């Protein structure tokens, strides 16, 4: 139900678009850079980075964070550096692994007895180790045991008020699995409640948060009118207005001001997907679905208007012109012709939709692995990273695009996580209604596990697949740059985030409204 509709978006007029605030922000960045210089103790430097990242400010102080981490990496092999502080050792491990520096799981072996496992009673060190454990790689048995020990400890905390909340939040979403800006409002309030806070950092955080909101509202005004012009919400009564919801995804994929064009193409692509998804899952017959798939494969407006059912013509032509204008924009901007690539990615999505439609017609229930092979495409993972790269990169690198098109492993496993996480949003009523089988039902069918156990096993699979993704991310030799890989991971992070605050089983909050439309006072 679209409350935040076109007229609502056009009517907004945030004060923080103004030039005055933009001047105070520059003044504050300067003073913060100076205060950073006076932080010399390593643990204080690590906590500074952690604070910058969770306030949403880190993209403003990138060289300063790079410096701190480079210098801590130089020194962390010194003789008496390992200070046997579980919190400090875990914080350093997280941050260094987050930014691609090698650190061994062996930095934790001192906190662990071979017989009785991990020994620690300090909640602060347990919480930090728990966050660090999500940077594990495949086969790091210390990191796996660390997760087993910390998650067990944190579950028992909820059988002091801030301690319980921290444990609850880390159990439902570790820092590695959340994009920076999504936690920004919560952490800003934690931060200002601190005695030792830096007052200029906090004020910069509130100001940049409100500025970001204003920037997004302007984009939404423009995206909104474009969506109204296509009138899809009018010809098809099922084509609902999911514009704000789509923009929320696009902002989780790429929040920074410079990615405005990326957010625009992502938002419109996702809105079109929800319309197409409806046609393939619900309203179209198989023969119609077969014609639409072919029309996309041919990429031929004349054929499409000749052969498509009436109710599909506008949906097709809206996609067709949107993608062709997308290709035009990139041709004009940087002389790069990516039409074959983008239309290939859309075809792949649509072909995967068809497969699912044929399974449903035959009432076939595939085994999980066969479901996921197709479901990693149909969840739009491969399409979304291709869109994000083509719309978010100047200059587009041919070898990098070619790597994305070769179906690389980082995209394979990220999209599987995405698909599993989305499928966990299914409710028990539909699990027991039983018409269309997804991850949970395929797993139940294949193992005889109950729904409750199936969900738990599927959640564990996600944690294990993130171990592979962590390897591909630290691989300095892939064609994908770090910033390209962040688009992909932010997509996965956004599915983890929306499982908690979305439509389905993981949930009056409306975090979307809170992220986009509700400033932080002062």
Short mmCIF file of C-alpha atoms in Angstrom, two decimals:
data_model
loop_
_atom_site.label_atom_id
_atom_site.label_comp_id
_atom_site.label_asym_id
_atom_site.label_seq_id
_atom_site.Cartn_x
_atom_site.Cartn_y
_atom_site.Cartn_z
CA UNK A 1 0.00 0.00 0.00
CA UNK A 2 1.66 3.18 -1.30
CA UNK A 3 1.40 5.87 1.37
CA UNK A 4 4.53 7.73 0.22
CA UNK A 5 3.21 8.38 -3.27
CA UNK A 6 4.09 10.81 -6.05
CA UNK A 7 2.32 13.86 -4.61
CA UNK A 8 3.91 13.18 -1.23
CA UNK A 9 7.40 13.03 -2.78
CA UNK A 10 6.94 16.18 -4.89
CA UNK A 11 5.78 18.11 -1.84
CA UNK A 12 8.91 17.61 0.25
CA UNK A 13 11.23 20.52 0.76
CA UNK A 14 13.98 19.67 3.20
CA UNK A 15 15.86 22.57 4.72
CA UNK A 16 19.16 20.63 4.46
CA UNK A 17 19.43 21.00 0.68
CA UNK A 18 20.68 24.52 1.40
CA UNK A 19 24.15 25.94 0.82
CA UNK A 20 24.62 27.00 4.46
CA UNK A 21 24.71 23.45 5.83
CA UNK A 22 27.03 22.37 3.02
CA UNK A 23 29.45 25.01 4.32
CA UNK A 24 29.29 23.93 7.96
CA UNK A 25 29.94 20.35 6.84
CA UNK A 26 33.19 21.36 5.14
CA UNK A 27 34.19 23.30 8.24
CA UNK A 28 33.52 20.21 10.35
CA UNK A 29 35.40 17.82 8.08
CA UNK A 30 38.44 20.06 8.44
CA UNK A 31 38.29 20.13 12.23
CA UNK A 32 37.67 16.38 12.41
CA UNK A 33 40.72 15.69 10.21
CA UNK A 34 42.76 17.70 12.70
CA UNK A 35 41.42 15.81 15.72
CA UNK A 36 42.24 12.52 13.95
CA UNK A 37 45.91 13.51 13.88
CA UNK A 38 45.91 13.71 17.68
CA UNK A 39 44.84 10.05 18.01
CA UNK A 40 48.07 8.07 18.32
CA UNK A 41 47.39 5.04 20.56
CA UNK A 42 46.54 2.04 18.32
CA UNK A 43 43.47 0.90 20.24
CA UNK A 44 42.14 4.46 20.17
CA UNK A 45 42.86 4.58 16.45
CA UNK A 46 40.95 1.34 15.89
CA UNK A 47 38.02 2.64 17.93
CA UNK A 48 38.13 5.87 15.90
CA UNK A 49 37.79 3.95 12.63
CA UNK A 50 34.97 1.85 14.12
CA UNK A 51 33.20 5.06 15.16
CA UNK A 52 33.65 6.72 11.77
CA UNK A 53 32.31 3.65 9.97
CA UNK A 54 29.21 3.23 12.15
CA UNK A 55 28.37 6.96 12.07
CA UNK A 56 28.25 6.70 8.27
CA UNK A 57 31.20 9.09 7.90
CA UNK A 58 34.00 6.82 6.68
CA UNK A 59 33.84 7.74 2.99
CA UNK A 60 34.89 11.27 4.01
CA UNK A 61 38.07 10.14 5.80
CA UNK A 62 39.33 7.38 3.52
CA UNK A 63 43.06 8.30 3.40
CA UNK A 64 43.05 8.84 7.16
CA UNK A 65 41.66 5.34 7.76
CA UNK A 66 44.01 3.82 5.19
CA UNK A 67 46.93 5.46 7.03
CA UNK A 68 45.92 4.20 10.47
CA UNK A 69 45.42 0.65 9.20
CA UNK A 70 48.60 0.55 7.08
CA UNK A 71 50.65 1.68 10.09
CA UNK A 72 48.99 -0.82 12.44
CA UNK A 73 49.70 -3.58 9.92
CA UNK A 74 53.37 -2.53 9.81
CA UNK A 75 53.62 -2.71 13.61
CA UNK A 76 51.36 -5.64 14.51
CA UNK A 77 54.19 -8.18 14.07
CA UNK A 78 56.30 -6.36 16.70
CA UNK A 79 57.48 -8.35 19.70
CA UNK A 80 55.02 -7.45 22.46
CA UNK A 81 52.17 -6.06 20.34
CA UNK A 82 49.64 -8.85 21.12
CA UNK A 83 48.18 -7.34 24.30
CA UNK A 84 46.02 -10.38 25.27
CA UNK A 85 42.93 -8.13 25.30
CA UNK A 86 40.19 -10.13 23.57
CA UNK A 87 38.30 -6.97 22.64
CA UNK A 88 41.36 -5.19 21.22
CA UNK A 89 42.57 -8.30 19.36
CA UNK A 90 39.09 -8.87 17.89
CA UNK A 91 38.62 -5.23 16.90
CA UNK A 92 41.98 -5.19 15.12
CA UNK A 93 41.22 -8.47 13.36
CA UNK A 94 37.81 -7.28 12.13
CA UNK A 95 39.04 -3.94 10.81
CA UNK A 96 42.15 -5.32 9.12
CA UNK A 97 40.23 -8.14 7.44
CA UNK A 98 37.43 -5.75 6.50
CA UNK A 99 39.92 -3.61 4.56
CA UNK A 100 41.74 -6.53 2.92
CA UNK A 101 44.85 -6.81 5.13
CA UNK A 102 46.00 -10.37 5.97
CA UNK A 103 45.61 -11.36 9.62
CA UNK A 104 45.82 -14.89 10.93
CA UNK A 105 43.15 -16.65 12.93
CA UNK A 106 46.14 -17.53 15.15
CA UNK A 107 45.91 -14.15 16.89
CA UNK A 108 43.08 -15.77 18.93
CA UNK A 109 44.78 -19.01 19.97
CA UNK A 110 45.91 -17.52 23.28
CA UNK A 111 42.29 -17.05 24.38
CA UNK A 112 41.45 -20.70 23.73
CA UNK A 113 42.34 -23.86 25.64
CA UNK A 114 42.54 -27.04 23.57
CA UNK A 115 40.37 -28.97 26.04
CA UNK A 116 37.77 -26.45 27.26
CA UNK A 117 37.69 -24.06 24.28
CA UNK A 118 37.40 -20.30 24.61
CA UNK A 119 37.81 -18.69 28.03
CA UNK A 120 36.42 -15.19 28.41
CA UNK A 121 33.90 -13.57 30.73
CA UNK A 122 34.09 -9.94 29.56
CA UNK A 123 30.99 -9.27 27.44
CA UNK A 124 32.78 -6.53 25.51
CA UNK A 125 35.45 -8.92 24.26
CA UNK A 126 32.86 -11.59 23.48
CA UNK A 127 30.78 -9.12 21.46
CA UNK A 128 33.85 -7.98 19.51
CA UNK A 129 34.99 -11.56 18.83
CA UNK A 130 31.49 -12.40 17.66
CA UNK A 131 31.66 -9.57 15.12
CA UNK A 132 35.15 -10.64 14.07
CA UNK A 133 34.05 -14.23 13.53
CA UNK A 134 32.01 -13.20 10.49
CA UNK A 135 35.27 -12.36 8.74
CA UNK A 136 36.21 -16.07 8.87
CA UNK A 137 37.40 -17.92 5.78
CA UNK A 138 36.55 -21.48 4.80
CA UNK A 139 38.31 -23.98 7.04
CA UNK A 140 39.42 -21.57 9.77
CA UNK A 141 38.48 -23.84 12.65
CA UNK A 142 39.40 -21.29 15.30
CA UNK A 143 37.08 -18.72 13.74
CA UNK A 144 34.29 -21.32 13.51
CA UNK A 145 34.72 -22.29 17.18
CA UNK A 146 34.84 -18.58 18.06
CA UNK A 147 31.42 -18.13 16.43
CA UNK A 148 30.01 -21.21 18.17
CA UNK A 149 31.29 -19.95 21.52
CA UNK A 150 30.13 -16.32 21.14
CA UNK A 151 26.71 -16.99 19.63
CA UNK A 152 25.99 -19.48 22.41
CA UNK A 153 27.08 -16.92 25.01
CA UNK A 154 24.98 -14.16 23.46
CA UNK A 155 21.83 -16.32 23.23
CA UNK A 156 22.00 -16.90 26.99
CA UNK A 157 22.21 -13.15 27.64
CA UNK A 158 18.54 -12.89 26.63
CA UNK A 159 17.14 -15.68 28.85
CA UNK A 160 22.46 -4.09 31.83
CA UNK A 161 19.75 -2.79 29.50
CA UNK A 162 22.28 -1.70 26.87
CA UNK A 163 24.22 -4.98 27.12
CA UNK A 164 21.10 -7.00 26.29
CA UNK A 165 20.30 -4.72 23.36
CA UNK A 166 23.83 -4.99 21.93
CA UNK A 167 23.67 -8.78 22.17
CA UNK A 168 20.23 -8.85 20.56
CA UNK A 169 21.37 -6.65 17.68
CA UNK A 170 24.59 -8.57 17.03
CA UNK A 171 22.65 -11.85 16.97
CA UNK A 172 20.16 -10.66 14.37
CA UNK A 173 22.63 -8.72 12.18
CA UNK A 174 26.44 -8.62 12.56
CA UNK A 175 28.31 -5.55 11.34
CA UNK A 176 29.76 -7.43 8.37
CA UNK A 177 26.23 -8.05 7.07
CA UNK A 178 24.91 -4.48 7.22
CA UNK A 179 25.64 -1.58 4.91
CA UNK A 180 27.00 1.47 6.75
CA UNK A 181 24.17 4.01 6.50
CA UNK A 182 21.41 1.62 7.57
CA UNK A 183 22.65 1.53 11.18
CA UNK A 184 23.62 5.23 11.20
CA UNK A 185 20.67 6.69 13.14
CA UNK A 186 20.85 4.06 15.87
CA UNK A 187 24.59 4.46 16.28
CA UNK A 188 24.46 8.27 16.25
CA UNK A 189 22.29 8.05 19.37
CA UNK A 190 24.54 5.48 21.00
CA UNK A 191 27.51 7.72 20.22
CA UNK A 192 26.09 10.93 21.70
CA UNK A 193 25.24 9.02 24.88
CA UNK A 194 29.00 8.46 25.41
CA UNK A 195 31.03 10.42 27.94
CA UNK A 196 34.23 10.45 25.85
CA UNK A 197 32.47 11.44 22.62
CA UNK A 198 33.98 13.89 20.18
CA UNK A 199 31.32 16.58 19.85
CA UNK A 200 32.36 17.73 16.38
CA UNK A 201 32.25 14.16 15.04
CA UNK A 202 28.69 13.70 16.31
CA UNK A 203 27.50 17.00 14.83
CA UNK A 204 29.10 16.13 11.50
CA UNK A 205 27.31 12.77 11.63
CA UNK A 206 23.87 14.29 12.24
CA UNK A 207 24.45 16.90 9.54
CA UNK A 208 25.64 14.45 6.87
CA UNK A 209 22.77 12.10 7.65
CA UNK A 210 20.25 14.89 7.14
CA UNK A 211 22.03 16.10 4.00
CA UNK A 212 21.95 12.59 2.58
CA UNK A 213 18.19 12.39 3.20
CA UNK A 214 17.65 15.66 1.33
CA UNK A 215 19.72 14.47 -1.62
CA UNK A 216 17.68 11.25 -1.81
CA UNK A 217 14.37 13.17 -1.65
CA UNK A 218 15.39 15.28 -4.67
CA UNK A 219 16.31 12.12 -6.59
CA UNK A 220 13.01 10.56 -5.56
CA UNK A 221 11.10 13.59 -6.92
CA UNK A 222 12.72 13.02 -10.30
CA UNK A 223 12.44 9.24 -10.28
CA UNK A 224 8.80 9.53 -9.18
CA UNK A 225 7.74 11.65 -12.15
CA UNK A 226 9.43 9.27 -14.56
CA UNK A 227 7.48 6.40 -13.01
CA UNK A 228 4.20 8.33 -13.26
CA UNK A 229 4.88 9.11 -16.95
CA UNK A 230 5.07 5.42 -17.82
CA UNK A 231 1.66 4.88 -16.25
CA UNK A 232 2.26 1.20 -15.52
CA UNK A 233 0.35 1.59 -12.23
CA UNK A 234 -2.68 2.53 -14.39
CA UNK A 235 -2.96 -0.11 -17.13
CA UNK A 236 -2.17 -3.02 -14.79
CA UNK A 237 -4.11 -2.94 -11.51
CA UNK A 238 -1.59 -5.37 -9.96
CA UNK A 239 1.36 -3.12 -10.87
CA UNK A 240 1.53 -1.33 -7.54
CA UNK A 241 3.75 1.62 -6.67
CA UNK A 242 6.89 0.06 -5.14
CA UNK A 243 9.06 3.05 -6.02
CA UNK A 244 10.11 4.05 -2.50
CA UNK A 245 10.73 0.42 -1.58
CA UNK A 246 12.85 -0.01 -4.71
CA UNK A 247 14.81 3.20 -3.97
CA UNK A 248 15.55 1.88 -0.50
CA UNK A 249 17.26 -1.15 -2.05
CA UNK A 250 19.18 1.08 -4.45
CA UNK A 251 20.39 3.27 -1.60
CA UNK A 252 21.55 0.23 0.34
CA UNK A 253 23.53 -0.85 -2.71
CA UNK A 254 25.16 2.56 -3.20
CA UNK A 255 24.50 5.31 -0.68
CA UNK A 256 27.11 7.89 -1.66
CA UNK A 257 26.11 11.21 -3.30
CA UNK A 258 28.16 10.49 -6.44
CA UNK A 259 26.09 7.38 -7.23
CA UNK A 260 22.90 9.29 -8.09
CA UNK A 261 22.71 7.88 -11.60
CA UNK A 262 23.38 4.39 -10.23
CA UNK A 263 20.52 4.73 -7.72
CA UNK A 264 18.20 5.98 -10.47
CA UNK A 265 18.78 3.03 -12.82
CA UNK A 266 18.73 0.56 -9.93
CA UNK A 267 15.43 1.98 -8.64
CA UNK A 268 13.70 1.89 -11.99
CA UNK A 269 15.11 -1.55 -12.80
CA UNK A 270 13.80 -2.94 -9.52
CA UNK A 271 10.39 -1.31 -9.98
CA UNK A 272 10.15 -2.88 -13.43
CA UNK A 273 11.21 -6.24 -12.00
CA UNK A 274 8.36 -6.22 -9.50
CA UNK A 275 5.94 -5.72 -12.42
CA UNK A 276 7.58 -8.46 -14.50
CA UNK A 277 7.83 -10.79 -11.49
CA UNK A 278 4.07 -10.38 -11.02
CA UNK A 279 3.46 -11.34 -14.64
CA UNK A 280 5.56 -14.51 -14.47
CA UNK A 281 4.51 -15.66 -11.01
CA UNK A 282 0.80 -14.84 -11.14
CA UNK A 283 -0.97 -13.40 -14.18
CA UNK A 284 0.58 -14.87 -17.36
CA UNK A 285 -0.09 -18.28 -18.87
CA UNK A 286 2.89 -20.37 -19.94
CA UNK A 287 2.44 -19.57 -23.64
CA UNK A 288 2.37 -15.84 -22.94
CA UNK A 289 5.41 -16.20 -20.68
CA UNK A 290 7.14 -18.03 -23.52
CA UNK A 291 6.36 -15.20 -25.94
CA UNK A 292 7.59 -12.52 -23.52
CA UNK A 293 10.84 -14.42 -22.92
CA UNK A 294 11.39 -14.63 -26.66
CA UNK A 295 10.60 -10.95 -27.18
CA UNK A 296 13.26 -10.11 -24.61
CA UNK A 297 15.74 -12.48 -26.26
CA UNK A 298 15.11 -10.95 -29.69
CA UNK A 299 15.19 -7.37 -28.35
CA UNK A 300 13.04 -6.34 -31.27
CA UNK A 301 10.29 -3.79 -30.68
CA UNK A 302 8.54 -4.62 -33.97
CA UNK A 303 8.33 -8.33 -33.18
CA UNK A 304 7.23 -7.58 -29.62
CA UNK A 305 4.34 -5.34 -30.63
CA UNK A 306 3.34 -7.86 -33.30
CA UNK A 307 3.20 -10.91 -31.05
CA UNK A 308 2.77 -9.94 -27.39
CA UNK A 309 -0.56 -10.11 -25.53
CA UNK A 310 -2.00 -6.66 -25.04
CA UNK A 311 -1.42 -6.51 -21.29
CA UNK A 312 2.29 -7.28 -21.83
CA UNK A 313 3.01 -4.71 -24.55
CA UNK A 314 3.39 -1.71 -22.28
CA UNK A 315 5.41 -3.59 -19.69
CA UNK A 316 7.70 -4.81 -22.47
CA UNK A 317 8.06 -1.47 -24.21
CA UNK A 318 8.73 0.29 -20.90
CA UNK A 319 11.62 -2.09 -20.20
CA UNK A 320 12.83 -1.84 -23.79
CA UNK A 321 12.98 1.97 -23.89
CA UNK A 322 14.39 2.23 -20.35
CA UNK A 323 17.25 -0.13 -21.21
CA UNK A 324 17.90 1.50 -24.58
CA UNK A 325 18.02 4.91 -22.90
CA UNK A 326 20.36 3.41 -20.30
CA UNK A 327 22.66 2.29 -23.12
CA UNK A 328 22.34 5.72 -24.73
CA UNK A 329 23.36 7.49 -21.54
CA UNK A 330 26.52 5.41 -21.16
CA UNK A 331 27.39 5.81 -24.84
CA UNK A 332 27.10 9.61 -24.51
CA UNK A 333 28.96 9.73 -21.18
CA UNK A 334 31.99 7.58 -21.96
CA UNK A 335 31.75 6.22 -25.51
CA UNK A 336 31.09 2.70 -24.22
CA UNK A 337 28.47 0.47 -25.84
CA UNK A 338 27.06 -1.95 -23.26
CA UNK A 339 23.68 -2.83 -24.78
CA UNK A 340 24.51 -6.47 -25.52
CA UNK A 341 25.68 -6.88 -21.91
CA UNK A 342 22.71 -5.25 -20.18
CA UNK A 343 20.09 -6.96 -22.33
CA UNK A 344 21.87 -10.30 -21.80
CA UNK A 345 21.59 -9.82 -18.03
CA UNK A 346 17.86 -9.05 -18.33
CA UNK A 347 17.31 -12.10 -20.52
CA UNK A 348 19.03 -14.25 -17.89
CA UNK A 349 16.61 -13.02 -15.23
CA UNK A 350 13.60 -13.63 -17.45
CA UNK A 351 14.80 -17.09 -18.49
CA UNK A 352 15.17 -18.03 -14.83
CA UNK A 353 11.62 -16.81 -14.20
CA UNK A 354 10.42 -19.12 -16.97
CA UNK A 355 12.13 -22.15 -15.44
CA UNK A 356 10.30 -21.55 -12.16
CA UNK A 357 7.03 -21.17 -14.09
CA UNK A 358 7.55 -24.54 -15.77
CA UNK A 359 8.35 -26.18 -12.42
CA UNK A 360 5.09 -24.83 -11.00
CA UNK A 361 3.06 -25.99 -13.99
CA UNK A 362 4.44 -29.53 -13.59
CA UNK A 363 4.05 -29.28 -9.77
CA UNK A 364 7.70 -30.35 -9.73
CA UNK A 365 9.63 -29.89 -6.49
CA UNK A 366 13.36 -29.66 -7.23
CA UNK A 367 16.05 -30.55 -4.76
CA UNK A 368 17.55 -27.55 -3.00
CA UNK A 369 20.72 -27.42 -5.09
CA UNK A 370 18.82 -27.47 -8.38
CA UNK A 371 16.43 -24.87 -6.97
CA UNK A 372 19.34 -22.63 -5.97
CA UNK A 373 21.18 -23.00 -9.28
CA UNK A 374 18.27 -21.26 -10.97
CA UNK A 375 17.18 -19.28 -7.90
CA UNK A 376 20.47 -17.42 -7.69
CA UNK A 377 19.63 -15.91 -11.08
CA UNK A 378 15.90 -15.38 -10.49
CA UNK A 379 16.56 -13.49 -7.25
CA UNK A 380 18.19 -10.85 -9.61
CA UNK A 381 21.69 -11.00 -8.06
CA UNK A 382 23.53 -11.28 -11.40
CA UNK A 383 21.26 -8.64 -13.00
CA UNK A 384 21.68 -6.16 -10.13
CA UNK A 385 25.47 -6.33 -10.03
CA UNK A 386 25.61 -5.83 -13.81
CA UNK A 387 23.32 -2.81 -13.54
CA UNK A 388 25.30 -1.43 -10.61
CA UNK A 389 28.59 -1.80 -12.46
CA UNK A 390 27.33 -0.40 -15.78
CA UNK A 391 25.60 2.55 -14.08
CA UNK A 392 28.09 3.16 -11.27
CA UNK A 393 31.51 3.02 -12.96
CA UNK A 394 33.22 5.64 -15.09
CA UNK A 395 35.23 4.36 -16.95
CA UNK A 396 33.71 0.93 -17.52
CA UNK A 397 36.58 -1.58 -17.86
CA UNK A 398 36.00 -4.20 -20.55
CA UNK A 399 37.90 -6.96 -18.72
CA UNK A 400 35.92 -6.25 -15.53
CA UNK A 401 32.58 -6.44 -17.34
CA UNK A 402 33.74 -9.62 -19.03
CA UNK A 403 34.53 -11.10 -15.63
CA UNK A 404 31.00 -10.28 -14.41
CA UNK A 405 29.57 -11.93 -17.54
CA UNK A 406 31.59 -15.15 -17.03
CA UNK A 407 29.43 -15.94 -13.98
CA UNK A 408 32.19 -15.63 -11.40
CA UNK A 409 32.17 -17.35 -8.03
CA UNK A 410 31.71 -14.22 -5.92
CA UNK A 411 28.47 -13.53 -7.84
CA UNK A 412 27.47 -17.20 -7.63
CA UNK A 413 27.71 -17.42 -3.85
CA UNK A 414 26.48 -13.90 -3.10
CA UNK A 415 23.34 -14.54 -5.16
CA UNK A 416 22.75 -17.86 -3.39
CA UNK A 417 22.89 -16.09 -0.02
CA UNK A 418 20.53 -13.44 -1.38
CA UNK A 419 18.11 -16.11 -2.61
CA UNK A 420 18.23 -18.11 0.63
CA UNK A 421 17.75 -14.99 2.71
CA UNK A 422 14.79 -13.82 0.65
CA UNK A 423 13.19 -17.28 0.82
CA UNK A 424 13.48 -17.20 4.62
CA UNK A 425 10.94 -14.34 4.48
CA UNK A 426 8.22 -16.83 3.51
CA UNK A 427 5.65 -17.24 6.27
CA UNK A 428 4.62 -20.52 7.87
CA UNK A 429 1.09 -20.05 6.53
CA UNK A 430 2.40 -20.24 2.96
CA UNK A 431 4.92 -22.95 3.87
CA UNK A 432 1.90 -24.99 5.00
CA UNK A 433 -0.38 -23.61 2.27
CA UNK A 434 2.11 -25.32 0.03
CA UNK A 435 1.55 -24.36 -3.59
CA UNK A 436 4.97 -23.06 -4.72
CA UNK A 437 8.14 -24.57 -3.19
CA UNK A 438 11.17 -22.42 -2.38
CA UNK A 439 14.33 -22.98 -0.31
CA UNK A 440 12.60 -23.99 2.93
CA UNK A 441 10.15 -26.43 1.32
CA UNK A 442 12.75 -27.98 -1.00
CA UNK A 443 14.98 -28.56 2.01
CA UNK A 444 12.13 -30.04 4.07
CA UNK A 445 11.08 -32.26 1.16
CA UNK A 446 14.67 -33.43 0.66
CA UNK A 447 15.68 -34.06 4.31
CA UNK A 448 12.41 -34.58 6.19
CA UNK A 449 13.38 -31.78 8.59
CA UNK A 450 10.64 -29.66 10.09
CA UNK A 451 10.10 -26.08 8.96
CA UNK A 452 11.72 -24.76 12.11
CA UNK A 453 14.82 -26.92 11.62
CA UNK A 454 14.93 -26.14 7.88
CA UNK A 455 15.05 -22.38 8.63
CA UNK A 456 17.91 -22.91 11.10
CA UNK A 457 19.92 -25.00 8.64
CA UNK A 458 19.30 -22.47 5.86
CA UNK A 459 20.55 -19.69 8.13
CA UNK A 460 23.70 -21.68 8.85
CA UNK A 461 24.26 -22.20 5.10
CA UNK A 462 24.29 -18.42 4.67
CA UNK A 463 27.02 -17.98 7.27
CA UNK A 464 29.05 -20.73 5.54
CA UNK A 465 28.58 -19.21 2.09
CA UNK A 466 29.73 -15.83 3.40
CA UNK A 467 33.03 -17.60 4.19
CA UNK A 468 33.59 -18.22 0.48
CA UNK A 469 32.62 -14.64 -0.40
CA UNK A 470 35.19 -13.40 2.12
CA UNK A 471 37.86 -15.26 0.16
CA UNK A 472 36.84 -13.86 -3.25
CA UNK A 473 36.76 -10.36 -1.74
CA UNK A 474 40.35 -10.52 -0.38
CA UNK A 475 41.60 -11.91 -3.73
CA UNK A 476 43.79 -9.00 -4.89
CA UNK A 477 43.97 -10.62 -8.37
CA UNK A 478 40.40 -10.63 -9.50
CA UNK A 479 39.30 -8.32 -12.30
CA UNK A 480 36.66 -6.90 -9.91
CA UNK A 481 37.81 -3.83 -8.04
CA UNK A 482 37.00 -3.47 -4.36
CA UNK A 483 34.39 -0.83 -5.10
CA UNK A 484 32.70 -3.11 -7.66
CA UNK A 485 32.63 -5.93 -5.14
CA UNK A 486 31.07 -3.62 -2.54
CA UNK A 487 28.01 -3.15 -4.81
CA UNK A 488 27.56 -6.92 -4.76
CA UNK A 489 28.03 -7.34 -1.01
CA UNK A 490 25.80 -4.35 -0.27
CA UNK A 491 23.03 -6.07 -2.25
CA UNK A 492 23.39 -9.14 -0.02
CA UNK A 493 23.60 -6.95 3.08
CA UNK A 494 20.38 -5.31 2.00
CA UNK A 495 18.57 -8.66 1.84
CA UNK A 496 19.77 -9.41 5.38
CA UNK A 497 18.57 -5.98 6.47
CA UNK A 498 15.15 -6.24 4.80
CA UNK A 499 14.52 -9.70 6.30
CA UNK A 500 14.30 -7.90 9.66
CA UNK A 501 12.35 -4.80 8.52
CA UNK A 502 10.37 -5.86 5.47
CA UNK A 503 7.13 -7.54 4.52
CA UNK A 504 7.71 -11.12 5.65
CA UNK A 505 8.53 -13.61 8.38
CA UNK A 506 11.60 -11.95 9.90
CA UNK A 507 9.59 -8.97 11.22
CA UNK A 508 4.78 -0.55 12.72
CA UNK A 509 8.40 0.60 12.32
CA UNK A 510 8.53 1.49 8.58
CA UNK A 511 12.31 1.79 8.56
CA UNK A 512 12.09 2.99 4.98
CA UNK A 513 10.22 6.10 6.02
CA UNK A 514 12.71 6.53 8.87
CA UNK A 515 15.74 6.21 6.58
CA UNK A 516 14.50 8.51 3.79
CA UNK A 517 12.07 11.02 5.30
CA UNK A 518 12.68 11.60 9.04
CA UNK A 519 15.63 13.87 9.83
CA UNK A 520 17.71 13.80 12.98
CA UNK A 521 16.77 16.89 15.04
CA UNK A 522 19.28 19.77 15.11
#
